[PDB]
C-alpha cells in the first residue's frame, strides 16, 4: 500500500520477486533546492542557427 | 568575503564564485557559535546579521 | 503511519515512550467555523500611535 505523503513529494518502490514479501520503497520530496538533478548534462547549442 | 544566510529557511551559502541555495521544511536556525583561528596578522572579523 | 485525511484537515499525534506501542493521535479539521481559536487574547492597541 502506498503511504500518505506530503502534497509535493513523490513515491516509488521496487524489489518484489524474491520469494518473500519484503520490498524497498522510496520518497523523493522535490523541496525547492534549485539545483536540478538529471542525467545527460547538455552538450552545446550549435552556433549560427 | 563570504557568508551564509538562513532568512525564512532560504539557506544560501555564498562565495564570490558561486552560491548554494537550499530550502528545508523542518529547518530553523537562530544560534551562531563563531570561532577564530589562534592568531591573525591584522584583526580577524565576523558579523552576525 | 499517518492516515489519509481530508485535504484541509490537520493531523498530530503524541504519547510514545511508555514501554508499549500504543499512542494518541488527533485530527483537527479547520472547517469554516469563523470563530478563531488561539491562546493569548489581544490586550489593547496603544492609542496615539
Amino acid at each position: 500500500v502506498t503511504p500518505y505523503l506530503k502534497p509535493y513529494e513523490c513515491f516509488g518502490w521496487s524489489w518484489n520477486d524474491n520469494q518473500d514479501s519484503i520490498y524497498d520503497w522510496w520518497i523523493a520530496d522535490f523541496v525547492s533546492t534549485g539545483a536540478f538533478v538529471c542525467e545527460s548534462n547538455p552538450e552545446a547549442p550549435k552556433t549560427g542557427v | 568575503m563570504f557568508g551564509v544566510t538562513w532568512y525564512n529557511d532560504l539557506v544560501r551559502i555564498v562565495f564570490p564564485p558561486t552560491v548554494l541555495e537550499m530550502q528545508l521544511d523542518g529547518l530553523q536556525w537562530e544560534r551562531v557559535q563563531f570561532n577564530s583561528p589562534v592568531n591573525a596578522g591584522h584583526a580577524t572579523r565576523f558579523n552576525v546579521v
Side-chain angles (χ1 to χ4, degrees), chain A, chain B:
Chain A
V1 176
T2 175
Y4 181 79
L5 50 93
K6 291 175 94 288
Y8 295 98
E9 78 182 3
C10 197
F11 171 72
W13 66 273
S14 66
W15 186 49
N16 54 359
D17 199 4
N18 49 5
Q19 289 84 23
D20 53 352
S21 190
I22 42 96
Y23 65 101
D24 281 327
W25 61 267
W26 52 86
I27 291 288
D29 59 351
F30 289 157
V31 281
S32 293
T33 305
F36 296 99
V37 49
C38 55
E39 68 271 14
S40 299
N41 49 356
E43 184 184 4
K46 58 175 180 175
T47 179
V49 187
Chain B
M1 188 183 292
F2 72 99
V4 293
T5 63
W6 53 85
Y7 179 70
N8 66 17
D9 304 332
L10 195 275
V11 177
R12 296 175 69 240
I13 299 95
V14 304
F15 293 97
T18 54
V19 300
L20 190 151
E21 189 268 322
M22 288 183 182
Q23 289 186 0
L24 185 59
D25 189 72
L27 200 281
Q28 50 190 355
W29 287 342
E30 193 173 0
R31 186 174 182 178
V32 169
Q33 293 180 357
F34 183 78
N35 286 316
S36 177
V38 287
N39 291 113
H42 295 86
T44 182
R45 70 279 309 275
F46 71 104
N47 187 4
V48 54
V49 49

